[PDB]
Amino acid sequence: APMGSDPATACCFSYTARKLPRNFVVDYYETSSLCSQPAVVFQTKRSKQVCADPSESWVQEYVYDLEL
Ligand SMILES: [Zn+2]
Ligand SMILES: [Zn+2]
Ligand SMILES: [Zn+2]
């Protein structure tokens, strides 16, 4: 899951290989450009924080859905 728990500095070294159901995703943040790779981290109803590849369409669609 990300290394660290502060959205300002936590980094992802892998991405989820499963699609998260929209009904279980409740929040997100973007990882810092200081991290080795870009990532969105989604928080879920099971209290997980899940790294995801921002180049995937569904990740972008969920981010807009949460933000706006
Ligand atoms: Zn939040
Ligand atoms: Zn779409
Ligand atoms: Zn904001």
Author numbering: 1 to 68
What does the published report state?
CC chemokine ligands (CCL) comprise 8-14 kDa chemotactic cytokines (chemokines) involved in diverse immune functions. Extensive structural analyses reveal that most chemokines share a common core structure: an N-terminal extension followed by a 310 helical turn, an anti-parallel three-stranded β-sheet, and an α-helix. CC chemokines also readily dimerize, primarily through the formation of an anti-parallel β-sheet at their N-termini. Certain chemokines, e.g. CCL3, CCL4, and CCL5 form polydisperse, high MW reversible polymers in excess of 600 kDa without the assistance of GAG.
The crystal of CCL4 P8A diffracted to 1.6 Å resolution is in space group C2. Unlike our previously reported crystal structure of the wild type CCL4 polymer, the structure of CCL4 P8A is monomeric. CCL4 P8A maintains the typical chemokine fold. However, CCL4 P8A has a distinct structure at the N-terminus. Instead of the extended loop found in wild type CCL4, the absence of proline at position 8 of CCL4 allows aa 6-9 to form a type 1 β-turn so that the N terminus turns back toward the three-stranded β-sheet of CCL4. This permits favorable hydrogen bonds to form between the main chains of residues at the N-terminal loop of CCL4 (Met3 with Cys11; Asp6 with Ala10). All prolines (Pro 7 and 8 in wild type and Pro 7 in P8A mutant) are in the trans configuration, thus the formation of type 1 β-turn is not due to the switch of cis-trans peptidyl bonds of proline. The N-terminal conformation of CCL4 P8A would lead to steric clashes between two monomers of CCL4 P8A, which prevents dimerization, explaining why CCL4 P8A is polymerization deficient. Furthermore, the structure of CCL4 P8A reveals that the P8A mutation promotes the formation of an N-terminal type I β-turn, which prevents the formation of anti-parallel β-sheet essential for CCL4 dimerization. A P8A mutation renders CCL4 predominantly monomeric without disturbing the integrity of its core structure (aa 10-69).
